[PDB]
């Protein structure tokens, strides 16, 4: 769409939208992030203050597969199995069958506690549990299993 640019409307203008007093010379302060501490310090100070420096230790060969731990809050636990299955087991109690929301199958390892769970007993099976997540599941009348 080169008929939509500014060059097609700026034909006939001598300076071509770049000024006469200060022309469009090649460089306007180095090439790239040059002058980070000399004459563009007012940029890497106003817009990236912590750019220059060192902070934190060095991980020589980081293994990003051991920090991987997706999390699901309690309020979203029932959406893994659905809203039809939730209503079907809405009157269950201790002794009768209740669905097991196997979080590890869906790709969520940790289970965090945020928001409110519906007042139905439920079984949750996941690798890691949060302290306030277990209370939220148990206070509703459920169970907290572990896997792997």
């Amino acid at each position: 769409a080169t008929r939509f640019r500014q060059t097609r409307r700026r034909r006939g203008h001598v300076s071509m939208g770049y000024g006469r007093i200060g022309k469009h010379r090649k460089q306007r302060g180095g090439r790239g992030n040059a002058g980070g501490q000399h004459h563009r310090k007012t940029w890497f100070t106003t817009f990236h203050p912590d750019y220059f420096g060192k902070h934190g230790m060095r991980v020589f060969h980081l293994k990003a597969n051991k920090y991987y731990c997706p999390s699901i809050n309690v309020d979203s636990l029932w959406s893994l199995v659905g809203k039809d299955v939730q209503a079907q087991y809405k009157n269950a109690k201790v002794g009768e069958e209740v669905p097991v929301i196997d979080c590890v199958k869906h790709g969520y390892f940790k289970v965090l506690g945020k928001g409110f769970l519906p007042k139905q007993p439920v079984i949750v099976r996941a690798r890691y549990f949060s302290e306030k997540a277990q209370q939220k599941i148990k206070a509703v009348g459920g169970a907290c299993e572990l896997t792997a």
């Binding site: 201790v94 009768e96 209740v98 669905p99 590890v104 079984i123 299993e145 792997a148």
Partner: protein, 267 residues
């Protein structure tokens, strides 16, 4: 945003346009088409195991490795020299990792070997394997009669309780524990009796003359994982009082406490 663009080096000579991609797809597809034509078990993509993935991030998803270990081919009663020639890969390098991986693959071979149908090494009807088949029909028929007899007297009990629990589950989904409790006691006795037993070193290659029904690959007729439906459990009183978080904070703290034990006993 501070730019990070690696164009300072030479790049116009380091480009790789993909204009051959429309024609690569055709070139390969006209190879498989002209490879199954030569001999169809050439493109059959010889059977591969069912192995888990490495690392704890994918340690629950199965995928096809390469080659069955020497322990699986012996457990599934297959010759290692013959297995390579009947569309089964072999990986002598791989070491067995679990007794569950040994059974899971040993069933994969057994199911495939029952589907396999090998044509005679020589097409003519006077082949020795075809000749030896008619020469041993009398012995084969007797063997099938005694195998069938003692395969039914031993399962005379596992059949009925498994029938009861399967039938009793129909009423509950329109008592059950009684049928399940009885089945558990029967299977325990069966397991003990087997231990309280040499067999064939090898099974027989299924060799027959049949119609040539040609299938491009063999890993797509034996599914990796059985389909998974919603899993439901009985919510007892024991599971309502399982302190899951307290267990995680106990297993972790034990691991951090192995340093204190060594420091204490070194003084």
């Amino acid at each position: 945003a501070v730019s990070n663009i690696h164009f300072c080096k030479d790049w116009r000579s380091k480009v790789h346009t993909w204009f051959k991609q429309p024609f690569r797809k055709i070139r390969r597809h006209q190879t498989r088409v002209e490879k199954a034509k030569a001999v169809f078990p050439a493109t059959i993509k010889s059977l591969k195991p069912s192995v888990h993935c490495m690392n704890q991030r994918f340690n629950y998803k199965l995928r096809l490795g390469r080659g069955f270990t020497l322990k699986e081919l012996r457990a599934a009663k297959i010759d290692k020299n013959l297995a390579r020639t009947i569309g089964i890969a072999v990986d002598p390098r791989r070491k067995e990792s679990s007794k569950e991986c040994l059974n899971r693959n040993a069933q994969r071979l057994t199911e495939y070997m029952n589907r396999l149908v090998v044509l005679p090494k020589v097409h003519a009807a006077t082949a020795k394997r075809l000749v030896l088949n008619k020469k041993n029909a009398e012995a084969k028929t007797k063997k099938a009669a005694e195998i069938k007899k003692f395969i039914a007297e031993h399962n005379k009990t596992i059949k009925e309780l498994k029938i009861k629990v399967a039938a009793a589950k129909k009423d509950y989904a329109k008592e059950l524990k009684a049928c399940l409790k009885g089945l558990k006691k029967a299977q325990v006795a069966f397991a003990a009796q087997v231990a309280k037993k040499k067999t064939k070193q090898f099974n027989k290659l299924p060799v027959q003359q049949k119609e040539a029904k040609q299938v491009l690959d063999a890993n797509k007729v034996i599914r990796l994982t059985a389909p998974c439906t919603l899993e439901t459990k009985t919510l007892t009183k024991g599971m309502k009082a399982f302190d899951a978080v307290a267990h995680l904070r106990k297993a972790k703290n034990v691991a951090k406490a192995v340093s204190g034990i060594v420091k204490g006993q070194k003084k």
